Amino acid sequence: SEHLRYCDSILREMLSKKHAAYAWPFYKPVDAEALELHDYHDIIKHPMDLSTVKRKMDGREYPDAQGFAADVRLMFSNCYKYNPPDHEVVAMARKLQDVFEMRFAKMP
Numbered sequence: 264s265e266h267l268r269y270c271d272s273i274l275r276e277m278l279s280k281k282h283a284a285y286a287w288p289f290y291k292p293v294d295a296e297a298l299e300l301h302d303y304h305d306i307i308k309h310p311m312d313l314s315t316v317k318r319k320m321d322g323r324e325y326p327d328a329q330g331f332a333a334d335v336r337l338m339f340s341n342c343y344k345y346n347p348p349d350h351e352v353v354a355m356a357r358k359l360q361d362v363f364e365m366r367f368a369k370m371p
């Protein structure tokens with residue numbers, strides 16, 4: 264759709280070097296074992312990351328832009344749910360979500 268191509272562009276920007284500094288914790292799925300997070304899958308029941316979003320976007324799996332946003336926001340919400348609000352990862356999550364929400368609001 265028209266809206267989904269703009270979403271594709273948002274995805275490109277989120278994956279670019281421009282934001283890598285704060286975006287990198289969301290590039291690949293959360294490896295709970297490598298990160299020794301023994302409670303991750305108790306708290307987060309629907310994991311989500313940027314690569315999964317690329318898969319769903321490249322496989323034409325989103326019905327419309329609103330499903331795209333649902334998955335992106337879900338990713339962010341999971342980060343906020345799991346960490347306490349003074350962790351730096353939450354600040355990075357907020358920076359990146361600022362980018363996403365800005366670009367999404369400015370959708371033509």
Ligand SMILES: CC(=O)OC[C@]12CC[C@H]3[C@@H](C[C@H]4O[C@]45CCCC(=O)[C@]35C)[C@]1(O)CC[C@@]2(O)[C@@](C)(O)[C@@H]1CC(C)=C(C)C(=O)O1
Nearest residue numbers: 288289292293294298300341342343345346350351352355
């Ligand atoms: C990949 C990794 O190093 O993980 C470690 C860590 C995230 C990043 C944090 C790091 C703590 C501080 O060392 C800082 C120093 C400053 C900034 C910083 O980035 C890190 C490396 C962690 O905070 C500890 C555990 C934790 O895994 C989580 C819980 O925050 C998960 C990690 C992930 C990927 C998600 C999506 C989440 O919800 O949160």
Ligand SMILES: [Cl-]
Nearest residue numbers: 329332367368
């Ligand atoms: Cl909305």
